[PDB]
């Protein structure tokens, strides 16, 4: 999975503003967030979002959700490296496994359950 | 800042949701 945002800024500076805002907002974690592709769906205004670490997955689903507002035909699913995150596991913990080496957290998101699809 | 964060009362909402 690709990312927008990684296009747009070079790894250097992702990197930078990642360290600082981890040492600067710690109870939260840096989160990029972007439509999967192909994905039929709402667009959200912003890609960063500083979130508490103690969220779990299943209420940053009910705070995207609520962003994008779900049609009768949608549905929602989260993609962190290739992967649904389980509704259960914290942002902190989601965080902790996956974030890149630029201390961001990417997340994809689409009506489907496979990404890309 | 440059970062969006949800508002006081989305996230007291979100602690109740799930």
């Given at each position: 999975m690709k990312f927008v945002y990684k296009e747009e800024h070079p790894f250097e500076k992702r990197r930078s503003e990642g360290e600082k805002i981890r040492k600067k907002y710690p109870d939260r974690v840096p989160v990029i967030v972007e439509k999967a592709p192909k994905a039929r769906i709402g667009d959200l205004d912003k890609k960063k979002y500083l979130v508490p670490?103690?969220?779990?997955v299943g209420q940053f689903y009910f705070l995207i959700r609520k962003r994008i507002?779900?049609?009768?035909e949608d549905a929602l699913f989260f993609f962190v490296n290739n992967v649904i995150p389980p509704?259960?596991?914290?942002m902190g913990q989601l965080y902790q496994e996956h974030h890149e080496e630029d201390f961001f957290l990417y997340i994809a998101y689409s009506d489907e359950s496979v990404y890309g699809l | 800042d440059d970062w969006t964060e949800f508002s006081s009362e989305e996230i007291r909402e979100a602690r109740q949701a799930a």
């Open positions: 670490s103690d969220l779990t507002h779900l049609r009768a509704t259960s596991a914290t | -």
